[PDB]
Curated annotation (Swiss-Prot), chain B:
The keyword rRNA-binding does not apply. InterPro entries: HATPase_C_sf (IPR036890), Heat_shock_protein_90_CS (IPR019805), HSP90_C (IPR037196), Hsp90_fam (IPR001404), Hsp90_N (IPR020575), Ribosomal_Su5_D2-typ_SF (IPR020568). The record marks R344 as: Important for ATP hydrolysis. It comes from Canis lupus familiaris. HAMAP family: HSP90. This is Endoplasmin. ATP binds at N45, D87, N100, F136. GO terms for molecular function: ATP binding; ATP hydrolysis activity; ATP-dependent protein folding chaperone; unfolded protein binding. Changing R344A: Reduces ATPase activity by 85%. The modification N6-acetyllysine is found at K375. Its EC number is 3.6.4.-. ATP-dependent chaperone involved in the processing of proteins in the endoplasmic reticulum, regulating their transport. Together with MESD, acts as a modulator of the Wnt pathway by promoting the folding of LRP6, a coreceptor of the canonical Wnt pathway. When associated with CNPY3, required for proper folding of Toll-like receptors. Promotes folding and trafficking of TLR4 to the cell surface.
Length: 650, 642
């Protein structure tokens, strides 16, 4: 009972040897010449990332002197501007990336630049941590970024000016570097100028527009003014001046509400390069394993190239950022296919990057991004007002939501509540599934729907004629994807969907059962009158009203289901000529009120071997197939029957 | 470069340095995406050691010294949490264990290779794999401590063990336990428990090391069940053998083994590509269409073709090397000259992807073209006919060559499919047009009122049965000079004799008739009415040149991947058609005698709306309203009884 004071443990490499002893511990070395060549020749895919790294280095340099500027009063001195400035020089085959950051002392120019996998930024980070404090803008981690500037240049000339030290010149050729004091005075007030002596194969980076698009591609949010010595050709002659590249302001960095509705729409217009305001937007911050904080958008109109090469075409609408630096627009694991219209940004600070800085190192961190992005998206679409949802949204991205029901399984219930279809409750207006079950009768327990090519052919369908007459609500499907969306949905609010073109619809009746038994002779004749496999059953329908009714099985293709499959291109030659083709099992149904009842029976009561009575019994079934929206086997069969029955009549 | 100064001066020069521990961490946690590549690297290293000791043997007679067997053996201890990769290669001296394993980016293989290139031997300059000295370090992706025991000739057996930080070397107190070679023992992490089950390892070596040119054995089970070494790589690299010295039966055996198929390939091709890139390749076409060939369609890379560099598996992702419509082509691609990324999972030069692609497609299409005509129609076209059609639409660079491979059902034979070169060889002396009809089936297409006069006159009509066919022909501007012509659209020009200009007189005879239909029958239904010059034995609907056919409309109306706007606001769905009227038709001649008798006549109007609606059905067009047609035909059936 009384606890003793003894404490347990919780934890603790063989080879068949007698005993293991210690001897001669070494430290790993490195052949620098071959390691350098690995980085330059066999590491990166795109050689354009050199500017991305040089700018990031310049950004870190700027952020460093800014932190020091806080705990100092003479840090900036003469020049208080913290800007990165890039200038081309085609006349001398040179590219310049100049910044006004902290710069580098002579010891640093040797140590930091001359040592692979050495990061002064990483070390600076460490001192700041030991010392709110916002290092969270420091991008550098590896020590190889600067060496990526040897991809497009034979020689790199680095001129740096650190406080309390002389301006020096650092020149290299990837094999060795020379460090010399600048003969000129402190031409640079403070900071660094990285000059690249480009190669003949890199003549592209001498041209202006190449650089402009390059800095805009990777570095447009790096929290420091980036200018490029550009031409304007106005006032009309060419005038050169520093043109700002990162115009856009990181709205995401600010917390909710600092900025309002206004500056949001402006952000969407500028970032996504759109002219019209977004239909909606969401600003949120996920935290935990992933912690990023992002802004997502839904466009006002459906993009022009939407649904073109669906699945294959990766959308560049969402751009991934890590520490204000662009990583990738590939969200095929962080965003599903049916949400390929959603635009926006995703920035983060502690997302582990690959050395390529184009992909996240941990593949496991992708789906945890998706679960938050998708959820925030579906909440955003749900947050859209009911009026605006039907009148504007659904026309644009209704198909997407339907596809979501088919694809996404973990959001099928949530997406189903966003579904909108036409109905019999209104000649034109669309309804939700929640609005259907709210208008459902007692003990209905079935959501009746009709699928067809158009609204007119669906509402004027022989099926559910008694259902509409009884007051049952019928959902009309007018688009090819509709039927699949419903078929992929098991139950909604405890109600099961029921196709009115297929069997399963059930509506005294026991007295009427005796009446059906009376209507037994004609059905038998139909199976004989009817060719071999022409029909399966010829019972009389109790769901008909005023129409002379091909009903599919519970596990059979509908007339509308059938037309879509048949018109689908991507299918093999062997597969096309298959699946039973046209016939399946065509069940006939009928109601008594006209020639269906006694007029056809009088002939059947007279003689079953008459030619006139077999022709009239054939055309009735013939036009019933088109009445039920099925494919006509022969256009000339039912066609010439009209050309002959109208010649003597008219 | 000059910079405002005319005094470029020379001061101190330095050599670059490295912070090893941080560069180590980069390789461990920030380089590779797949942690399973560790076994790929150890096998390659083991292979290199085996190739070195063999190259020495060719000049040194005392190298083997009673250890002639050159193999690789893998054994994993589940109980002891260990993984052993043992070879009988050249091994490493004590100095080499420190130099080669302790110096990052240092490759002893690269040094061994350069010595041979310097003088005359190019015998095995393509057998050695290791270039950058970082592969061995991928062992710490799945292991905390790596123990390496090596025995080199003319030196004692030493033991090398380490974590990422420091490494130690010690002479093995067990002595010469390995006759010659190396054993890399990996103390696997908790997470890397999967590499302890032999079957996981079994598939892993087979995945990458299938043609490593050295016997690889794994300690596995085989049924009383007993344990022994099982050979992994048995599939010989036949592509290295020249086209003349390779057995035709070997190709069939190679395919059924490499691609895991029970049936022989429909065809094969063996070629050596030189120039910008240099590689050997054996492409294959399966005997039957793979299930799910088009299920993903687009967005799906096919693991049918595999890329090998120096007999080591690189990748199966080809999408930049092979187009979508050739996703059925299987085979191998091997090179010894293609520069690789440090990850060894992709090519380094992206520009070379286009170079390989154009070579592979070229040899693929020629391979298809080489197939005998007799076996082509009966086997290939049935399985991959759809692919060729898609290729016509997609590949513009080879649209002509792919067109020569197209096959379609013609009116020249009840069931046989024909070539387009056969069609143009069966055209008249002044046809210069390829007439075709598109429909849901052949029965619908051959019994269509558009081909009535054409077949009677002596012209040939191609029948398109599959919905992708019209897309395929649309992508074709002209074939052998001739131009495709839709028989359901305007353009067909028939008869230039005196009987043709006599039809101009019939135009005036039908002029009051023509205008009546535009205003009696629904004016917003029928576009226009014109005299039908191409109509024989039928009552009655053509479309414009750049307009939808009845078939074309049937497909678009089923295309599910469209927005709710594009389907509701599509003009072609609401577009009207030109109604053509045949003069010889008895039902048409009695129609002009009824309007005059009773213009604004009710019965006269009725037949016109009925005929037009039957014309919509006779063509591929869907009836706008079927209830109005279904009720009026119920009144027509009242002729028997009311
Ligand atoms: N423009 C610059 N101004 C000032 N200091 C710089 C500049 N560029 C580089 N440095 C310093 O030199 C060090 C080496 O940089 P680098 O080798 O590019 O690795 P990095 O800074 O971590 N970038 P990366 O390898 O992509 O993570 C940096 O950590 C800085 O301390
Ligand atoms: N099992 C072994 N037997 C003999 N020598 C070995 C063995 N493993 C490694 N070595 C030597 O150690 C050197 C360093 O290994 P490694 O880091 O893999 O360089 P590598 O051969 O270029 N591998 P890779 O990265 O794929 O190019 C190799 O170049 C070999 O000379």
């Amino acid at each position: 009972v009384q606890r003793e004071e003894e404490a347990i443990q919780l934890d603790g490499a063989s080879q068949i040897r007698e005993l293991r002893e210690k001897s001669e511990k070494f430290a790993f070395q490195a052949e620098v010449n071959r390691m350098m060549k690995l980085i330059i020749n066999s590491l990166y895919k795109n050689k354009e990332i050199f500017l991305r790294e040089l700018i990031s280095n310049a950004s870190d340099a700027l952020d460093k002197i800014r932190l020091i500027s806080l705990t100092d009063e003479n840090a900036l001195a003469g020049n208080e501007e913290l800007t990165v400035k890039i200038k081309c020089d085609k006349e001398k085959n040179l590219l310049h990336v100049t910044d006004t950051g902290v710069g580098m002392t002579r010891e640093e120019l040797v140590k930091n630049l001359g040592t692979i996998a050495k990061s002064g930024t990483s070390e600076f980070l460490n001192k700041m941590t030991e010392a709110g404090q916002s290092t969270s803008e420091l991008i550098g981690q590896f020590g190889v970024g600067f060496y990526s500037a040897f991809l497009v240049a034979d020689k790199v000339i680095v001129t740096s000016k650190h406080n309390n030290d002389t301006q020096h010149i650092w020149e290299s050729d990837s094999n060795e570097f020379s460090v010399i004091a600048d003969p000129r005075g402190n031409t640079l007030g403070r900071g660094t100028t990285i000059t690249l002596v480009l190669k003949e194969e890199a003549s592209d980076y001498l041209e202006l527009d190449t650089i402009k698009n390059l800095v805009k591609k990777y570095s447009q949010f790096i929290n420091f003014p980036i200018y490029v010595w550009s031409s304007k050709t106005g006032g009309g002659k060419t005038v050169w001046d520093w043109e700002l590249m990162n115009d856009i302001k990181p709205i995401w960095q600010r917390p909710s509400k600092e900025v309002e509705d206004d500056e949001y729409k402006a952000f969407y217009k500028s970032f996504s390069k759109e002219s019209d305001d977004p239909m909606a937007y969401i600003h949120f911050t996920a935290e935990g394993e992933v912690t990023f904080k992002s802004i997502l958008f839904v466009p006002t109109s459906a993009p022009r190239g939407l649904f073109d090469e669906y699945g294959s075409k990766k959308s560049d609408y969402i751009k991934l950022y890590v520490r204000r630096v662009f990583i990738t627009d590939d969200f095929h694991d962080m965003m599903p296919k049916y949400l390929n219209f959603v635009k926006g940004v995703v920035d983060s600070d502690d997302l582990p990057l690959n050395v390529s800085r184009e992909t996240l190192q941990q593949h496991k961190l992708l789906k945890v991004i998706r679960k938050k992005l998708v959820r925030k998206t579906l909440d955003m679409i749900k947050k859209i007002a009911d009026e605006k949802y039907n009148d504007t949204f659904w026309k644009e991205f209704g198909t997407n939501i339907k596809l979501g029901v088919i694809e996404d399984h973990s959001n099928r219930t949530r997406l189903a509540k966003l579904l909108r279809f036409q109905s019999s409750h209104h000649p034109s207006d669309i309804t939700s599934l929640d609005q259907y079950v709210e208008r459902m009768k007692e003990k209905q327990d079935k959501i009746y729907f009709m699928a067809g090519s158009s609204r007119k052919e669906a509402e004027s369908s022989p099926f559910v004629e008694r259902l509409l007459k009884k007051g049952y609500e019928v959902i009309y499907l007018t688009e090819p994807v509709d039927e699949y969306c419903i078929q992929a949905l098991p139950e909604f609010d405890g109600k099961r969907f029921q196709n009115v073109a297929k069997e399963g619809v059930k509506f005294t009746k026991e007295s009427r059962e005796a009446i059906e038994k009376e209507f037994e002779p004609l059905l038998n004749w139909m199976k004989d009158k009817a060719l071999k496999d022409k029909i399966e059953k010829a019972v009389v329908s109790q769901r008909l009203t005023e129409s002379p009714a091909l009903v599919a099985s519970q596990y059979g293709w509908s007339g509308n289901m059938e037309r879509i499959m048949k018109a689908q291109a991507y299918q093999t030659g062997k597969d096309i000529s298959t699946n039973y083709y046209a016939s399946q099992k065509k069940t006939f149904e009928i109601n008594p009120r006209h020639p269906l009842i006694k007029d056809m029976l009088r002939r059947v009561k007279e003689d079953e071997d008459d030619k006139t009575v077999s022709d009239l019994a054939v055309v009735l079934f013939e036009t019933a197939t088109l009445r039920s929206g099925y494919l006509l086997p022969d256009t000339k069969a039912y066609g010439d029957r009209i050309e002959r029955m109208l010649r003597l009549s008219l």
